[PDB]
Design a protein around this ligand. Structure first.
Ligand SMILES: [Cl-]
Ligand SMILES: [Cl-]
Ligand SMILES: [Mg+2]
Length: 162
């Protein structure tokens, strides 16, 4: 198990445009196309992301390429955010993977907004942090994509992905 396998389980892999649990246009392994309500803007963003005329469809290799880019962007996003970086750096290896997953799913801005959860994690208040995350809109609207991440923050092991 590793962060790639983890996110492949939570997000799955789809090769045409869909709405994610937040309601935004998405493809491949959780790749956010736009927050625009407009399907044309998503279709143009898919072509822009890939470098060719896709007409809403991609290959498995193109998805895996987008996926590497997106996990690298989530890690860089955490490190470059003043609120997230110290918290992240205080986490053990497995909880770091839950942190990357959360950012990959929700984005930096969304995660950074949860000031109290970040303090709970930095202070190693795993049960409280998990209770609080299970009360977010993310959990309530994305319970199948979020449940295992929250448990991972609670326990610090890979067991929810077994
Ligand atoms: Cl560790
Ligand atoms: Cl879900
Ligand atoms: Mg690291």
């Amino acid at each position: 198990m590793n962060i790639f396998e983890m996110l492949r389980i939570d997000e799955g892999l789809r090769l045409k445009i869909y709405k994610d649990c937040e309601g935004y246009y998405t493809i491949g392994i959780g790749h956010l196309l736009t927050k625009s309500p407009d399907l044309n803007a998503a279709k143009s963003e898919l072509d822009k992301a890939i470098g060719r005329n896709c007409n809403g469809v991609i290959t498995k290799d193109e998805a895996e390429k987008l996926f590497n880019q997106d996990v690298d962007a989530a890690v860089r996003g955490i490190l470059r955010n003043a609120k997230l970086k110290p918290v992240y750096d205080s986490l053990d290896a497995v909880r770091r993977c839950a942190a990357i997953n959360e950012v990959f799913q929700m984005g930096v801005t969304g995660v950074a907004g949860f000031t109290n959860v970040l303090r709970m994690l930095q202070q190693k208040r795993w049960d409280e942090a998990a209770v609080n995350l299970a009360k977010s809109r993310w959990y309530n609207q994305c319970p199948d994509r979020a449940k295992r991440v929250i448990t991972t923050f609670r326990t610090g092991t890979w067991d929810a992905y077994k």
